RNA sequence: CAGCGAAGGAUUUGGUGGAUUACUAGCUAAUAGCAAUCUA
């Protein structure tokens, strides 16, 4: 849910040369298109997908 | 008969004394004020 | 890097400066001769004097010390300080206590030298600035308290390291610690580089000699089962077998020889190393105890020389400087002794080198191996050279009566020599 | 004090002022142009006061033999093959592929037989087969493989005749009233001795066999015969090929051991002699040439309990001579006692003494000796013990210095009941309890 | 794996000579193929660690040329039990790859160096070196006749090369592994085969193009073909023979193996069979 | 106690070198 | 052939190639140059940094290259191109066909000697511009006046003179008139090497037999001579820091110093490189600094540092040897297998025929990093066998990472080159792991696979058998007995629910994974050689021996695209990670794109050297491809990625 | 003890080097100079 440094709990190993931890508080689908929001501190974050890429086949010959 | 010459040569081989890990650690004790020649003989004696 | 590694450093570099009185008295009560409180109510002039009158006592056993009396020891360095002047101030001074140090090497066994070299640890501090020259200077006698005045008082030197159990100890350091002080490399080419400043100054003492070949024994005996040490080892001593071997002294020469021989004995060099060697060991040979270890140096060297090629004629430059040096009664004579030693491989070389090199001296030959035993392949490359002596030159009543000898013993050999090239009828018809 | 001058540089004139780095090697502060010599010889200083000028340029310009020698060498011991015989203390020891590791073995392995000349190798024991196997480097493949129900083997040998050298027969034999002979044709024809011409009585078991050569010293004729360690003292010899009793050598208390030597005599004659020992340590050494009586008897300085005697340093049972001519007289005698002492002698003078002294009595392994086996050269000797795991040491000799550098800890030698030394490749059989031979190759040779 | 390092057949498959080690020493040995016309006796190389890596029949007293690994081809009669005459480079380099046409022999370094010698004269004719190409261990003359032109070089990378010039006039794609067999088929084509792959690839010499791809069903150890081009029969590493039944003609563009072979005894064990020929 | 080898911080220093630019002379 | 979907962006993993590289020094900073192939690599001395890439590949090889303050001189084909932060800023065009091979920089001259032995000098126009641009004259090297030019010196303080190395004289030109200023006697044997000393007018010749001459161009004469027998002198390099030491660089790869002063030998450094791959092929010190940078034909570049001494009063006698400080470095041999370590296209695991696994970054080259092959202790206690004289392991046939659980426990899977075991590797710790798969049939294993839940590993044996082991604990959990000739190929769902297998008996049998059933088994029409399985849209493609890829999908089982085109036996191919593409890699010499909702060939890339591996990234970022020559992975962009390509097919 | 077991095995520790963020070079008075020097 994030690459940020300036935020805390991301990195599992740290450059061996409070800040606002990252978490997500809430997570739902979309009632209406494949898709879901998460809360986390960046924002709502919202991952969906699209048809419009990734060809997936449905028994085709 | 080139191999009867090998064996002859390896078999003309005598029995030496090797040097150990304590084969000259005994000198310490009389290299005081010996003259150097009877350090050779010592040391030839162990070698021998 | 840290801050207090960096302030080791800069105390490491102002280790003599007194900054203060506490320091000076910790500084100044580091004496050779006297305890620390006296040592600290001490001035320069009472130390300067009674150094001056012990280097006058040295002077008159050895008169080398006077012109350290004219520059090391005069009026002018009671007030000269050690860090006041330049680099290169400075390097003259150390040449100087370096120079002082082995000259008055030997000498430390008369309190004479005790009280001269008191003034250099407290007024140039030496123990603390001339540090290693010290040590290797004195480390023939550390069963004394002489040695363990200097480590008491000493800053060991990191190569000098196994020795930091032994200062302020009331126990001298043992023979096992003196080997594991010279079984490290770097200490080696240390101790190698002291030896050199020693023969060129021409102050090799034989108490020194002896301890430095115990040494040097005893480091070549504990590495015998690694042969990388062993390799790692060679240049360092046989280097220092050729500076020794290059000298005047006796005591220096038969010091090199038993090195040589421990080092051949150990493992088994390379014939022309070897070959080399004999070379260096004739090409300054003297003395009568040193041509008593040469010979026997000699011998053993080529006794630890195996594979095709151990008992050629050795060459015609190396064969007749071996000739300049031991002729043919010395030969015969120490072949004559009741306690025997083991020159096969050499007596044999010898005597194919005086076959391919003299052709006159064939009677001595037959007397010294009517004198020493031989093996089957040195008797037999003996007779299949004096067979081509015979097909050579034409065969006079020495090689007839040679032959005679190896009929006489073992003819079953020169007819398997004769069947192998040529024919006992033929040979016969010859001679 | 130049080799060439160009005549270039002198009408040269550069400028100095231009650039800040030619800018420091005036002399004056209205020198602006100089000719090219003295601006050559201003950057000549400038680059020796960048680069100080060391000592090694000017110091000197190209007793001593030491040390040019040691400055020209890199390596100062002998190369490859200007060695010819063993260096002490540390092995050259490769380890190949485990011999029978094609075709398993069911038993502890109990005897194991290079061929003289070919490259096959017998391996046999308890479970009453004998396999052949063609051995390499990499696949150690099965030539052929006889399975005698009944008849668990104890030694098995490969025995070739000195006249012709086409026989190649294989004895067999354990703990049973017969040994078996299987003649090689590459079916099997197979034969069996059951028969001491009147002598069952003093061998009831044919376990401990040796083959040897035996001359007829009237005519040039050879004839192989094995020799069988009996109850008594005796050991029966008997020929290989008809199997008759032909005589009989009784040492004087519990026969524990035999070995045999021969040594030439003239072109074309030999001479044989077996060396047999008592428990106590005494050995008989018997002419059977003649008829078989002794020559001399000795006995072994220390030694209480004795388990193997062997010869060593010429042709022994396990090196044997492909030629008449090629026989040898061996060199070394190890006695190896229940101890784990092993005496060595060296009869190149302890044939004289009567009382004679060993060269070395080797003591570092502390059990009882089972195998002791010298290398076909004999430089090295094999002391082996079945009765703990990993007890292997390869001594050589003259000096009489176990190698110190194998085995190691990490020798997957087992619990060694058997060893074998080729005839030519310099290699190494070790078999142990569990059925394996392992394989090594020394690269002296 | 098999004990026989090397083996080749005479032509007509008459003879087959063959290198094995015995207890660390390389011996060579010929067996005649048919009984109906043992052989107990080999060529011993002394050496431990002198070893055959490649070997010829020559075509006349009948022999073999050894190429060695220290840079030496040795010239063996097989009648008698010598080594007739000892082929040397100047170097200690390990020889890949021999070849001859008529009586001159051509061989290939793991220096990449070629070397000419001449069998009827025992000399060292030509040697040379060729740029970019640099890991070669197979060489094949393309016959014309007594005329040497045209060797066939290859690296995992076949490589066309006139000799007059010394130089390459066509490259060809070889495989992803060193290429292990490298044979002339007609005088319009050649077969090529790689280390453990079981694809051979039929190279047209004259254009470059790949006629045709042959897919053995395992990885191929050797290959035979008759000496019309009409059968092609190459073993495997499974033990296993595959015959390609005329491969040159219109399974269009990649053949599979027509007939396939293999040996068991009467128990069940599958022995592998090693180095065919075909006629 | 054997002697220490261990390694130390190594840093580069400031060199100067000769540059050949200056061994370049044109004529008038 | 050009393409229309994939361009090239880099070649990664290249460090050298055994041109001898050249040092450049900016202020008190240094840089290295080195060649790879046709491009060249500036490093930064101080921590071996990759400054700057040139920024073309040139026509042909760089040959010679050389580095004053900011500018950096390659001489390839014909002529010499001047570069300043790897974009080219001149190119010098010479007047003829000879191959330029070796060239100088001194002044405003810039000279260039051919293997014609002719040298061509060119000049700046006024002396305040960067780069000698014009021509100025030619200088020959006659067959009188000496041998072959084997190296192109100007020793310093010799104003616009020149000294030229030949294989047995040394010349000394004045290039500004034009002349031959002084001819040396001749040598007796051939001279390779030549270094100008800091010491003034002496330079260092190192000839075919072992020795290093030390010239004295003014007087003509030799100062001295040093022996190194059997040894061929590659390099030539001299301390400039107050202790005057020499270091030549040995053909057998070995690093051999010398004290001058003292004359004796300080220290030895044996196999720094490999011979095979050319010994040790430039060796320089930084000026003013006790460390050596040292560079060989085997993909590699390393520093040696000189300790300062450890006596406190001698010094200059005990020469403590040169220690190992960074070194970078790459495979010595080309790579035989790539994969993808992460999903970000930063790391990729590559392994090669010299028997190494590297992990290479996209991102920093610093970052790569050869993966450990120190293996753990036994589980129960024992002992391990093998050598002690330690290997590495045999070259790696196949891998399969998924990196689910990674750190947690092992994470690679990989398969060597004909032996029985499948070796596990974790990447987070880049070291090998604990468990050594067995295939349990006496089979060499010619497939991995590892499902993306981590915690099974697939084996598939050549005698076609699939075993099914835990990543976590390393035990055997189940085997399959379909196959009967060797299993090419394994893979699993995404929801670990059905495995997917194919061998080269040409049947691609369907199981239940979590019941342990078959759900089918489908028999094509040529034996199967690779499989790869879209994960996402369930497709997986297989390249048969009849050289068409069939797509078929594990749903319902159906051959539903099959692809014709390809000429030869294909050696890859991998899914578009959007699964509408396939890019496959043939013998001959041929990449084709197969958009494979049309079934068609949307672009083909012909490429002289064969492509042995294609994988895309698990983005749609990159293509990279593996050749048969060459050390390194090529790496191509998709410009999909940022325009739309028309999924028309070529043809031709 | 069995078992594992290639010219040895185990444990502990000091130092250094490389990564721990995604690679466009050093210095300065900076459209350029220097880097052998900024100063007359």
Redo the contacts between chains.
């Keep these: 849910v994030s690459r940020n440094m300036a935020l805390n709990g991301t990195l599992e190993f740290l450059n061996s040369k409070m800040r606002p931890e990252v978490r997500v508080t809430s997570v739902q689908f979309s009632p209406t298109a494949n898709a879901f929001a998460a809360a986390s501190t960046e924002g709502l974050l919202i991952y969906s997908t699209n048809d419009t890429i990734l060809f997936d086949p449905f028994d085709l010959d | 008969d080139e191999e009867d010459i090998a064996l002859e040569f390896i078999n003309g081989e005598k029995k030496d004394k090797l040097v150990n890990m304590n084969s000259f650690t005994s000198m310490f004790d009389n290299i005081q004020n010996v003259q150097m020649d009877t350090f050779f003989d010592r040391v030839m004696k162990v070698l021998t | 890097s840290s801050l207090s590694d960096q302030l080791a450093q800069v105390a490491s570099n102002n280790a003599t400066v007194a900054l203060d009185r506490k320091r000076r008295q910790k500084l100044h009560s580091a004496s050779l001769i006297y305890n620390s409180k006296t040592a600290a109510t001490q001035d320069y002039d009472f130390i300067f004097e009674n150094a001056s009158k012990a280097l006058e006592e040295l002077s008159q056993i050895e008169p080398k010390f006077a012109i350290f009396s004219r520059t090391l020891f005069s009026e002018s360095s009671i007030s000269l300080d050690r860090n006041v002047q330049t680099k290169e101030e400075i390097k003259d001074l150390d040449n100087a206590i370096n120079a002082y140090l082995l000259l008055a090497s030997s000498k430390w066994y008369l309190a004479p030298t005790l009280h001269a070299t008191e003034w250099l640890v407290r007024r140039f501090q030496i123990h603390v600035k001339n540090t290693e020259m010290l040590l290797l200077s004195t480390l023939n006698y550390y069963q004394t308290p002489v040695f363990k005045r200097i480590l008491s008082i000493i800053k060991l030197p990191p190569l000098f390291n196994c020795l930091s159990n032994f200062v302020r100890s009331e126990k001298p350091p043992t023979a096992l610690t003196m080997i594991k002080l010279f079984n490290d490399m770097d200490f080696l080419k240390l101790y190698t580089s002291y030896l050199d400043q020693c023969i060129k100054h021409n102050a090799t003492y034989t108490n020194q000699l002896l301890f430095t070949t115990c040494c040097f024994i005893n480091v070549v005996a504990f590495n015998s089962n690694n042969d990388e040490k062993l390799n790692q080892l060679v240049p360092i001593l046989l280097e220092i077998s050729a500076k020794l071997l290059a000298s005047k002294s006796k005591d220096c020469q038969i010091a090199a020889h038993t090195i040589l021989v421990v080092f051949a004995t150990a493992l088994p060099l390379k014939k022309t190393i070897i070959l080399a060697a004999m070379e260096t060991i004739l090409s300054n040979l003297d003395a009568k105890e040193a041509k008593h270890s040469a010979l026997l140096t000699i011998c053993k060297l080529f006794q630890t020389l195996k594979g095709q090629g151990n008992v050629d004629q050795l060459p015609s430059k190396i064969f007749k400087l071996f000739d300049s040096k031991f002729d043919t009664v010395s030969i015969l004579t120490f072949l004559d002794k009741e306690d025997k030693p083991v020159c096969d491989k050499f007596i044999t070389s010898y005597t194919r080198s005086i076959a391919r090199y003299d052709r006159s001296k064939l009677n001595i030959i037959l007397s010294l191996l009517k004198k020493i035993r031989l093996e089957r392949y040195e008797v037999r490359l003996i007779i299949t050279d004096l067979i081509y002596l015979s097909e050579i030159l034409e065969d006079k009543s020495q090689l007839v009566e040679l032959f005679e000898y190896f009929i006489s013993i073992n003819e079953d050999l020169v007819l398997k020599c004769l069947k192998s090239l040529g024919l006992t009828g033929e040979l016969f018809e010859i001679r | 004090e130049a080799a060439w001058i160009d005549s270039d540089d002198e009408k040269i004139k550069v400028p100095i002022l231009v650039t800040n780095k030619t800018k420091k090697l005036r002399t004056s502060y209205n020198e602006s142009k100089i000719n090219g010599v003295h601006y050559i010889n201003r950057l000549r200083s400038q680059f020796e006061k960048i680069y100080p000028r060391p000592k090694w340029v000017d110091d000197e310009s190209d007793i001593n033999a030491l040390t040019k020698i040691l400055s020209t060498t890199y390596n100062y011991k002998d190369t490859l093959s200007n060695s010819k015989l063993l260096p002490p203390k540390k092995l050259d020891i490769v380890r190949l592929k485990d011999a029978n590791a094609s075709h398993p073995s069911h038993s502890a392995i109990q005897s194991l037989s290079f061929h003289p000349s070919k490259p096959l190798l017998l391996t046999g024991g308890y479970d009453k087969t004998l396999r052949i196997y063609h051995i390499d480097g990499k696949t150690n493949h099965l030539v052929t493989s006889l399975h005698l129900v009944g008849s668990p083997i104890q030694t098995c040998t490969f025995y070739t005749s000195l006249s012709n050298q086409n026989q190649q027969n294989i004895f067999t034999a354990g703990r049973r009233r017969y040994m078996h002979s299987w003649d090689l044709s590459l079916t099997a024809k197979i034969e069996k001795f059951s028969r001491l011409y009147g002598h069952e009585s003093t061998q009831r078991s044919f376990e401990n066999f040796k083959v040897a050569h035996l001359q007829n010293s009237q005519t040039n004729s050879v004839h192989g015969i094995v020799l069988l360690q009996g109850n008594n003292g005796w050991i029966n010899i008997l020929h290989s090929t008809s199997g008759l009793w032909l005589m009989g050598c009784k040492i004087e208390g519990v026969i524990t051991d035999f070995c045999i030597d021969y040594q030439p005599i003239s072109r074309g004659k030999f001479r044989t002699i077996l060396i047999a020992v008592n428990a106590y340590g005494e050995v008989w050494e018997f002419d059977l040439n003649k008829n078989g009586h002794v020559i001399r008897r000795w006995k072994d300085q220390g030694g209480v309990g004795i388990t193997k005697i062997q010869v060593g340093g010429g042709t022994t049972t396990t090196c044997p001579a492909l030629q008449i001519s090629k026989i040898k007289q061996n060199r070394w005698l190890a006695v190896g006692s229940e101890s784990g002492f092993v005496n060595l002698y060296d009869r190149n003078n302890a044939m004289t003494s009567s009382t004679p002294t060993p060269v070395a009595a080797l003591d570092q392994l502390t059990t009882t000796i089972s195998n002791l086996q010298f290398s076909p050269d004999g430089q090295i000797l094999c002391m082996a013990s079945r009765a703990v795991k990993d007890a292997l040491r390869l001594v050589h000799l003259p000096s009489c210095s176990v190698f110190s550098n194998w085995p190691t800890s990490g020798t997957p030698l087992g619990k060694v009941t058997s060893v074998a030394f080729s005839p030519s490749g310099g290699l190494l059989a070790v078999g142990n309890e569990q059925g394996k031979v392992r394989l090594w190759k020394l690269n002296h040779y | 794996d098999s004990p026989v390092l090397q083996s080749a057949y005479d032509p007509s498959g008459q003879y087959l000579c063959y290198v094995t080690v015995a207890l660390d020493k390389q011996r060579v040995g010929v067996q005649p193929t048919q009984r109906a016309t043992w052989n107990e006796n080999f060529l011993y190389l002394e050496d431990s660690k002198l070893k055959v890596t490649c070997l010829k029949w020559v075509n006349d007293t009948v022999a073999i040329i050894l190429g060695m690994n220290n840079g030496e081809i040795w010239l063996y009669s097989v009648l008698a039990n010598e080594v007739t005459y000892k082929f040397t480079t100047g170097n200690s380099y390990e020889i890949k790859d021999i070849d001859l046409m008529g009586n001159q022999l051509w061989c290939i370094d793991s220096s990449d160096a070629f070397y000419q010698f001449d069998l009827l004269q025992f000399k060292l004719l030509q040697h040379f070196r060729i740029n970019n190409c640099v890991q070669l261990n197979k060489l094949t003359i393309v016959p014309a006749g007594d005329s040497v032109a045209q060797l066939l070089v290859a690296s995992h990378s076949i490589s066309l090369i006139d000799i007059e010039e010394k130089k390459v006039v066509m490259t060809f794609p070889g495989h992803v592994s060193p290429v292990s067999t490298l044979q002339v088929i007609t005088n319009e084509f050649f077969i090529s085969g790689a280390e453990g792959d079981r694809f051979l690839n039929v190279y047209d010499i004259h254009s470059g193009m790949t006629k045709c791809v042959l897919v053995a069903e395992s990885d191929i150890k050797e290959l035979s073909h008759s000496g019309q081009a009409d059968s092609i029969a190459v073993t495997t590493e499974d033990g296993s023979l595959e015959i390609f039944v005329d491969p040159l003609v219109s399974g269009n563009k990649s053949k599979k193996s027509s007939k396939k072979i293999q040996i068991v005894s009467k128990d069940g064990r599958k022995v592998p069979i090693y180095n065919a020929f075909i006629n | 106690p054997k002697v220490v080898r261990e390694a130390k911080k190594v840093e580069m220093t400031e060199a100067r070198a000769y540059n050949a630019d200056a061994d370049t002379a044109k004529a008038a | 052939k050009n393409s229309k979907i994939f361009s090239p962006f880099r070649i990664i993993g290249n460090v050298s190639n055994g041109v001898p590289f050249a040092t450049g ?1 900016l202020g ?3 840089y290295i140059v080195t060649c790879v192939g046709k491009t060249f690599q500036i490093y930064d ?2 921590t071996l940094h990759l400054l700057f890439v040139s920024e073309k590949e040139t026509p042909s090889s760089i040959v010679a290259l050389s580095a004053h ?1 900011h500018y950096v001189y390659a001489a390839y084909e014909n002529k010499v191109g001047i570069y300043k932060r790897g974009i080219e800023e001149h190119l010098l065009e010479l007047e003829t066909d000879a191959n330029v091979e070796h060239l100088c920089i ?4 810039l000279c260039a000697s051919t293997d014609d032995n002719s040298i061509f000098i060119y000049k700046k126009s006024d ?1 305040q511009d960067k780069y000698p641009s014009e021509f100025y004259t030619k200088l020959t090297v006659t067959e009188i006046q000496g041998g072959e030019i084997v190296s192109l010196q ?1 020793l ?6 020149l000294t030229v190395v030949t294989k047995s004289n040394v010349l ?1 030109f ?1 290039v ?2 034009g ?1 031959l ?2 001819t040396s006697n001749e040598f007796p044997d051939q001279i390779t090497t030549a270094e100008p000393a ?3 007018d ?1 330079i260092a010749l190192g000839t075919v037999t072992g020795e290093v001459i030390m010239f004295n161009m ?8 040093i ?3 059997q040894s061929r002198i590659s390099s030539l390099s001299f301390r ?3 202790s ?1 030491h020499l270091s030549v660089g040995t053909s057998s790869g070995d690093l051999i110093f010398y004290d ?2 003292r ?3 300080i220290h ?1 450094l044996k196999n720094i490189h490999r011979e095979s791959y050319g010994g040790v092929t430039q060796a320089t010190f ?6 050596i940078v040292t560079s060989g034909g085997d993909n590699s570049l390393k520093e040696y ?1 000189f ?2 001494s ?5 010094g200059d ?4 040897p040169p ?1 190992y ?1 960074r070194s970078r470095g790459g495979h010595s041999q080309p790579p035989s297998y790539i994969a993808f370590a992460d999903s970000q296209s930063h790391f990729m695991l590559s392994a090669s025929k010299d028997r190494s696994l590297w992990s290479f970054s996209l991102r920093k080259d610093a970052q790569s990093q050869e993966m450990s092959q120190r293996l753990h202790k036994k589980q129960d206690g024992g ?1 391990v066998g093998g050598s ?1 004289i330690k290997s590495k392991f045999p070259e790696i046939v196949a891998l399969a990472i998924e990196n689910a659980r990674i ?1 947690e426990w092992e994470n690679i899977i990989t398969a060597h ?1 004909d032996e029985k075991f499948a070796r596990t590797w974790d990447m987070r710790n880049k070291r090998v792991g604990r468990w050594t798969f067995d295939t349990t049939d006496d089979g060499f294993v010619k497939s991995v696979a590892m499902s993306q839940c981590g915690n099974f590993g697939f084996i598939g044996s050549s005698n076609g058998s699939i075993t099914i082991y835990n990543m976590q604990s390393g035990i055997l959990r189940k085997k399959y007995k379909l196959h009967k ?1 060797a299993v090419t190929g394994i893979s699993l769902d995404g929801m670990n629910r059905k495995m997917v297998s194919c061998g ?1 008996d040409g049947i691609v049998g369907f199981y239940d994974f979590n019941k342990s059933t078959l759900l089918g088994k489908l028999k094509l029409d040529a ?1 199967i050689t690779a499989m790869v399985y879209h994960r ?2 369930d ?1 997986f493609a297989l390249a048969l ?3 068409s890829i069939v797509v078929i ?1 594990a ?2 089982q ?1 051959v ?1 695209r099959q692809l014709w085109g390809h ?3 294909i ?1 890859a191919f991998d899914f578009s990670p ?3 593409w396939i890019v496959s890699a043939s ?3 041929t990449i084709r794109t197969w958009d ?2 049309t079934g068609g060939c949307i672009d083909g890339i012909i490429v002289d050297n ?1 492509a ?1 591996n294609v994988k895309f990234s698990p983005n749609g970022d990159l293509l990279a491809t593996t050749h ?1 020559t060459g050390n390194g992975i090529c790496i191509w962009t998709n410009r999909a990625q940022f325009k739309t390509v028309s999924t028309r097919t070529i043809d031709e």
Excluded: C
């Design positions: 020094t008190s900073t240094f001395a101080n303050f001194f002044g405003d001259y002396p100007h310093a303080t010799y104003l616009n003179k000394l004045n500004r008139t002349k200023v002084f800091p010491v003034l002496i003014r007087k003509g004469k030799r100062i001295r001579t022996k190194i027998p400039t820091d107050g005057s001058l002063d004359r004796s030998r030895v930084l000026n003013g600094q006790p460390i540092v300790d300062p450890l006596s406190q009063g001698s006698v005990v020469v403590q220690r400080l002992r002690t750190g080159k000739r080269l034996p996402s849209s497709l021996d009849d050289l999908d749903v319902t159906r539903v000429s030869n036996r050696t959007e699964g509408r013998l001959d010499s494979l909702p064969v042995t048969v």
